[PDB]
Design a protein around this nucleic acid. Structure first.
Lengths: 164, 85, 218, 92, 64, 131
RNA sequence: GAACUUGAGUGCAGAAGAGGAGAGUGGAAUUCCACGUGUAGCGGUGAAAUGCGUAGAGAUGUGGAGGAACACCAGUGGCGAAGGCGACUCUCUGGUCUGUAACUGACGCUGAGGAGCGAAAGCGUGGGGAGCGAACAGGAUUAGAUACCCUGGUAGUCCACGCCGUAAACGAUGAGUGCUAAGUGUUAGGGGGUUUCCGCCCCUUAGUGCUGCAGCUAACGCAUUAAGCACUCCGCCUGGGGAGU
């Protein structure tokens, strides 16, 4: 459902781009920041914000990031299963890893998976390296994840009839 | 028309109901290729009928390979009847 | 069960395959709704709208057609809740605070013309007060005394008003609604199949739902 | 099956017109092309002038042939000066 | 519009019907199009074939 | 033509998922019947039924949408294509989404599932991933 | 190895089509030719001029010659593998679609290499030459004008055969098959519910347009005529230039 934003959030940012618009006078600039926000207990989100300044852009990005939140399954403090997220010529696979590895990921993917609270991810980007589409690709891959309990309830089944 | 095809059916019937049965079908193809080839000797500048003739030759050759792989003696007796060699 | 109604229901050739579970087909070319799939759904709508007006979110009644005007207006002024009788201003719900500002401005200026000082200039009352009161009253309706976010939303036509339904579905407000055969039942949370331009059917349905919420406040 | 419709020029006497029709029927009997029906519309006003003339005689001959004396009719009607028109239509 | 030949049930238009073809031919001598005479596609094709053959036997005019 | 019918039944199930259709007719060879029996016994399907007829027969599938609108089957895949067949040994049998999905693998003793072939410790054609 | 009939094809029955090749015929008009009318212009341009014209032009009537394309039909209409194919008729001939049930019973698809077709220009040989028209000439515009404009006009365009074998040869989208909402014209069928009909509605094919859902896509858009979801086969790409050298 829509996640009510009343939690404790850490709100660190990925990029601020400087972003121009040409008028009769000349170039008029803005700063388009995208910021990933979420607690490390299974709730992640990100948001874009545009302003003439950097900090008000980060304000609008943190507000829009608190608006759009996602949930992530933490089966054994990892992800449950390997998945490829495919938002628009950004494709990122996510493997579960063993318990000691740490989040092996590049910058915005690393920011999503560290601010997710998921600790042990093998991952790889198989596409373009814009931050926006890589974060969108990760959340495409994290929206389609599945809990073993819910899929066992989906199959008219039990967890141990799937998990073993 | 319509005595020639019917005579070729009634000549190459192996059962009464045979209008399929690739000997009937190959025989209609042979005499239509022969009429077409005499047509091409009349009309050398016709190319779409040549494409149709090539389609007929491909159909008839593939039906011949099907008879060769299905029944050897029937294939040899058909060849010896039609002279298609 | 035809309780009171008249609605076979609407459209010709421009129609939606997402209502295949609900409709029939007449030789007229105008579609007839299966009323067996209407009675049970309006019964569950009746129950759920009783539950929502039992809990305490007020109700929005929104109708933005010439048919819908007097029906939605008189019915919500019968039930006391918050209506929209004219255009739906873009962003009343998702853009809530700047609409609260403009409705507080309307409240100030309609208090000023009967309690406050009425003698400022010869025509600042005309050019400000009257001209400004007209538009704001006509469009801000009975959502004037709203004070709070609503719980649900009762519309009259989703195809006519895709903007309000869209940002309603965004803000996760559950919505009750009458749809048409060209409309999308996937978008409405609570689907009622009936006629959206026969005035007696829309007056009947707003009557039933206002009676449903009227049996609820006790 | 063929409809063989031709126009005799008007300035022609009646026995000479019989000699024209007997001639071209003698031409049709070079095949075996049986004459299953005859028709003379007579002197009709042509829609446009042919040589100098407004009018001409029409002849309809229904034939069931082997497509040879039709072609002999074609060559004999391109030559004979006592003919204004001819068409042969495959009656289907 | 409405087709003529579907109404009277008549098939191959039979070039000899000079008065009917004279109805379909326009005032100057041209063939009227399908949105004027109201026929089918098939019947307009056979009509124009009919008019051209009847022109070559002077049953129909070219220019008037 | 048609070049393999198993991949075509898997896309037919996938298109019925994406449209959210509720029933499917599939032209029902014997391996298709055994696949649908596996997908029945693994709870991907409500129930599967056979219509034995003259042409080739029909198998009908009743797609399972357990909650609000929830496709239990998200995606299907065919591994051994007719033009690259794939065969796995028993110490290479893939367990998919590690436990949460499955692979239909037809070994020498019956068209098996993942756990069935693992407990029988044999391998054969590897002919579907089912997620 | 044996069966089956859906895929494929034959059989029967219609239907439509500028599908092709050979031959014949027609009516405007353009040009040219001769005669009558008759006199000073005609033609052309943004403006003019070269040209044509009293040796009688342009206009006009009749007649004749010759070539090429076939107005109206004509339509996001049809057919073809593509190039492409628009008058008509006959001769031969290729394919499609529809209704099935008569037959065969997997006989099918793709296809490197090979064989053929292959717009237009071009080449060889012989004809042909009305219009147009590269090249070329004169006049203009212009700083220049090997150009655009105008007046002329060669090869060529045409036909027969032989060669070339190339195009933005385009749907800038290989072929096959299956699945995956709709609405709506249209092309050719078929069938139903009243009417023998007229006609309306409904249903189903195969082809052809537009708008459009899921899905795809970088976006534009495609969307059952896919650029979706799949399988088979082939061709092709791996930075731009150098270089298609």
């Amino acid at each position: 459902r829509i996640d009510p934003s009343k939690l404790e959030l850490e709100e660190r940012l990925v990029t601020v781009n400087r972003v121009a618009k040409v008028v009769k006078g000349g170039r008029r600039f803005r700063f388009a920041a995208l910021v990933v926000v979420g607690d490390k207990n299974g709730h992640v989100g990100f948001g874009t914000g545009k302003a003439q300044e950097v900090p008000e852009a980060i304000r609008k990005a943190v507000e829009d990031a608190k608006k759009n939140l996602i949930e992530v399954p933490m089966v054994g403090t990892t992800i449950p299963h390997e998945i490829i997220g495919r938002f628009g010529a950004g494709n990122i696979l996510l493997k579960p890893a063993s318990e000691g590895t740490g989040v092996i990921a590049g910058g915005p993917v690393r920011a999503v998976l560290e601010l997710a609270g998921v600790a042990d991810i093998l991952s790889k980007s198989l596409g373009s390296n814009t931050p926006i589409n890589m974060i969108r690709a990760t959340l495409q891959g994290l929206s389609e994840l599945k809990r073993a309990e819910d899929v066992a309830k989906l199959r008219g089944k039990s967890v141990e009839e799937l998990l073993g | 028309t319509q005595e020639r095809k019917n005579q070729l059916i009634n000549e190459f019937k192996t059962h009464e109901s045979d209008t399929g049965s690739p000997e009937v079908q190959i025989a209609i193809l042979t005499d239509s290729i022969n009429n077409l080839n005499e047509h091409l000797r009349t009309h050398k500048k016709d190319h779409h009928s040549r494409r149709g003739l090539l389609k007929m030759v491909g159909k008839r050759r593939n039906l011949l390979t099907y008879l060769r792989n299905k029944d050897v003696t029937r294939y040899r007796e058909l060849i010896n009847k039609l002279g298609l060699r | 069960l035809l309780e009171a109604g008249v609605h076979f229901g609407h459209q010709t050739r421009r129609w939606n395959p997402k209502m295949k579970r609900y409709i029939f087909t007449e030789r007229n070319g105008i579609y007839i709704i299966d009323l067996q799939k209407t009675v049970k759904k309006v019964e569950e709508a009746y129950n759920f709208t009783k539950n929502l007006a039992a809990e305490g979110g007020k109700i929005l009644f929104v109708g933005t057609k010439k048919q819908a005007q007097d029906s939605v207006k008189e019915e919500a002024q019968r039930s006391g809740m918050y209506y929209v009788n004219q255009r739906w201003l873009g962003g009343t719900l998702t853009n809530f605070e700047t609409i609260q500002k403009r409705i507080k401005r309307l409240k100030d200026i309609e208090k000023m013309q009967e309690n406050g000082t009425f003698d400022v200039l010869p025509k600042k009352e005309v050019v400000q007060l009257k001209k400004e009161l007209e538009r704001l009253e006509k469009f801000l309706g009975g959502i004037k005394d709203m004070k709070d976010l609503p719980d649900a939303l009762f519309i009259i036509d989703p195809r006519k008003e895709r903007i309000a339904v869209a940002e309603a579905r965004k803000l996760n407000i559950p919505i009750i609604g009458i749809v048409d055969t060209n409309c999308d039942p996937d978008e409405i949370d609570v689907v009622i199949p009936a006629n959206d331009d026969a005035i007696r059917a829309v007056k009947l349905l707003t009557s039933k739902m206002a009676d449903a919420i009227l049996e609820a406040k006790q | 099956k063929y409809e063989v419709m031709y126009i005799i020029r008007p300035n022609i006497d009646e026995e000479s017109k019989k000699a024209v029709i007997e001639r071209f029927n003698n031409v049709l009997t070079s095949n075996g092309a049986e004459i299953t029906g005859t028709k003379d519309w007579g002197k009709r006003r042509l829609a446009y002038e042919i040589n100098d003339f407004r009018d001409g005689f029409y002849q309809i001959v229904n034939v069931q042939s082997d497509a040879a004396a039709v072609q002999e009719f074609d060559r004999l009607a391109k030559i004979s000066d006592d003919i204004i028109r001819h068409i042969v239509v495959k009656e289907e | 519009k409405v087709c003529y030949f579907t109404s009277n049930g008549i098939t191959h238009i039979d070039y000899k019907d000079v008065d009917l073809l004279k109805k379909f031919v326009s005032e100057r001598g041209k063939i009227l199009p399908r949105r004027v005479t109201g026929t089918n596609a098939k019947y307009q094709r056979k009509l124009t074939a009919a008019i051209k053959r009847a022109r070559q036997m002077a049953l129909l005019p070219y220019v008037s | 033509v048609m070049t393999d019918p198993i991949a075509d039944m898997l896309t037919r199930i996938r298109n019925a998922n994406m449209v959210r259709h509720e029933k499917l007719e599939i032209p029902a060879s014997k391996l298709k019947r055994e696949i649908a029996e596996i997908l029945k016994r693994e709870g991907f399907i409500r129930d599967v039924e056979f219509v034995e007829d003259s042409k080739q027969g029909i198998i009908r599938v009743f797609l399972k949408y357990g909650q609000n609108n929830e496709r239990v089957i998200t995606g299907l895949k065919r591994i051994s294509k007719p033009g690259l067949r794939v065969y796995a040994k028993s110490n290479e049998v893939p367990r998919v989404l590690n436990g949460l999905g499955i692979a239909i693998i037809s070994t020498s003793q019956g068209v098996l599932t993942d756990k069935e072939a693992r407990a029988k410790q044999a391998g054969g054609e590897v002919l579907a991933y089912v997620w």
